[PDB]
Amino acid sequence: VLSEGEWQLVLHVWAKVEADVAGHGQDILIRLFKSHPETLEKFDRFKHLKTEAEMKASEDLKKHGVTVLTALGAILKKKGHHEAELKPLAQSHATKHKIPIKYLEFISEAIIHVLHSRHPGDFGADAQGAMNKALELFRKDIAAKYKELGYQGG
Ligand code: HEM
Secondary structure (H helix, E strand, O other): OOOHHHHHHHHHHHHHHHHHHHHHHHHHHHHHHHHOHHHHHHOOOOOOOOOHHHHHHOHHHHHHHHHHHHHHHHHHHOOOOOHHHHHHHHHHHHHHOOOOHHHHHHHHHHHHHHHHHHOHHHOOHHHHHHHHHHHHHHHHHHHHHHHHOOOOOO
16 A cells, blocks of 8 residues: 555654653653543543643553554554454454544544654654555554444544
């Protein structure tokens, strides 16, 4: 789907994420919750966290951010050949809970924001476009897996 050069830009910046998965995951989740507070409602065990400092101090939130970015990184490294990885994630997101595709757009925005805030020298326009396409592909394929399970993602 993406070109080889696009995937290489995606994985180049992802290598920077891997130097500090926990910190990236905290900042991505906090940006998501700050920018779109309705998403915090989906996490019953994070609802009692009232400030950014409380969110940074929560080991539970930090652990979940690592779980999130580990799954995403594994998907990105498949360079689109990710059906076996996306199916369980769709089930996690469409069965136990109901995570609309729009919420995946919100977290994608937070991912772009944090990557550019931390790594501007390795996340210029071409890299941003590549990551945007990779996350678009992720969201499109997740949406199809949602429908397979009976969830329209709305
Ligand atoms: C890049 C996008 C995302 C990725 C890669 C991702 C990944 C994951 C993973 C790996 C799990 C654990 C699944 C398991 O082990 O059973 C999970 C659970 C969950 N996700 Fe996501 N997630 C993403 C976005 C979101 C968003 C945007 C929301 C809500 C607005 C959300 C809500 C949840 C909830 C509520 C759970 C259950 C966690 C719990 O039981 O405490 N996810 N996610």
